[PDB]
C-alpha cells in the first residue's frame, strides 16, 4: 500500500484471520529484519525463499486452533508520518503501563541499519526509527 512495513503488517493481519499457512510479503531491508525478529520471539514458524530480495513467504505459527500473532500494527498508522524513537522511548516501551514488557515486541531500525527489538535497544542504550509492533 503506502509503506512496505504497512503492507507487511496488513498482509499478515489479513492472512492470520483466514488461517493460511504462507504469506508472500515484499522483501525490503527493514521488512526481513522485522520478520527475523518476529521469528526469534516465536511469533513466526518459519520462512520460504528468504534470500529473495523482492518477496519472501512467512510460514505462520498456530497453536490449538487460533493464531499466535494476535495484533500486528505498523508505527506509521496513516502510512505517511514516520517516527524517530529516542532511547528514552525504548525504555518507555520496555516498561509500559507499570509492568516489565517482554510480551509486546516493539521493533526499530538503528542508524547502523540493524533491525533491533525494544529489549536489545535498551540493553545497549540506543534508539532508532520505529517500524511496527506485534504481540
Amino acid at each position: 500500500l503506502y509503506t512496505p512495513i504497512y503492507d507487511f503488517c496488513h498482509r499478515i493481519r489479513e492472512a492470520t484471520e483466514q488461517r493460511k499457512r504462507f504469506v508472500v510479503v515484499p522483501s525490503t531491508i527493514e521488512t526481513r529484519g522485522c520478520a527475523r525478529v518476529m521469528h526469534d520471539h516465536g511469533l513466526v514458524a518459519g520462512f520460504r525463499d528468504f534470500h529473495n530480495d523482492r518477496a519472501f513467504a512467512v510460514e505462520l505459527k498456530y497453536f490449538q486452533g487460533d493464531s499466535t500473532i494476535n495484533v500486528i500494527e505498523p508505527c506509521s498508522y496513516d502510512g505517511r508520518t514516520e517516527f524517530e524513537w529516542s532511547p528514552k522511548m525504548m525504555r518507555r516501551l520496555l516498561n509500559t503501563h507499570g509492568i516489565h514488557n517482554r510480551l509486546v515486541v516493539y521493533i526499530c531500525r538503528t542508524a547502523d541499519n540493524r533491525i533491533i527489538d525494544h529489549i536489545h535497544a535498551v540493553k545497549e542504550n540506543i534508539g532508532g526509527r520505529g517500524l511496527m509492533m506485534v504481540h
Partner: protein, 153 residues
C-alpha cells in the same frame, strides 16, 4: 459466525478449568487427546494425424470427383500402402510435397488397376451369361416378390 466454534468452545472450557475452581467434564480431556477436525490448512500420433488428414483430403478428391468411382472395395490396403510408401520415401528423406505427389500417383495407378480388373470381371460375367452376382440375385428375389404382390392384388 465464528463465535460458536469447537475450537473457541474448547478454549473457553480450558480457561474455565484453569482457574482451579471448576471441575472439567470427561469430554474436555478427551478432546485434548482427540481434537476436532479443522477445515483450514488443506490414440494416434499427431504427425500421423496430420499425415492421414492430408492424405484423406487429397484422396477423397481423386476418388470422388476425379475417378467418379463410389463402389471401391477394401480401401484400407491402398491407404496403408500410401502410408508405407510415404515412410519409404521419408527413410531417404527426399521432400515433403513430392513424396505426396508420388504416393498419389501410385494410388491413382492402383485405383485404375482395381477399376480395370472389376470391369474385366464384370464384362466376362455378363458376356457368358452363366454367372450372376449377389446383388443381381437380391434384385431378382425382390422384383419377383413384387410381381407376386402384383399378382396378389
Amino acid at each position: 459466525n465464528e463465535k460458536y466454534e469447537p475450537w473457541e468452545h474448547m478454549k473457553r472450557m480450558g480457561r474455565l478449568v484453569g482457574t482451579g475452581f471448576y471441575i472439567p467434564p470427561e469430554w474436555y480431556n478427551h478432546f485434548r487427546m482427540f481434537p476436532p477436525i479443522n477445515h483450514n490448512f488443506q490414440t494416434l500420433s499427431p504427425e500421423r494425424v496430420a499425415l492421414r488428414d492430408e492424405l484423406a483430403r487429397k484422396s477423397r478428391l481423386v476418388a470422388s470427383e476425379g475417378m467418379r468411382y463410389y463402389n471401391i472395395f477394401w480401401v484400407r490396403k491402398p491407404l496403408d500402402t500410401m502410408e508405407k510408401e510415404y515412410y519409404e520415401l521419408k527413410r531417404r528423406g527426399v521432400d515433403h510435397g513430392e513424396a505426396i505427389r508420388k504416393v498419389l500417383q501410385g494410388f491413382y495407378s492402383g485405383l485404375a488397376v482395381k477399376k480395370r480388373v472389376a470391369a474385366i470381371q464384370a464384362e466376362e460375367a455378363k458376356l457368358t451369361g452363366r454367372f450372376i452376382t449377389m446383388r443381381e440375385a437380391t434384385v431378382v428375389l425382390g422384383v419377383l416378390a413384387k410381381l407376386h404382390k402384383e399378382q396378389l392384388t
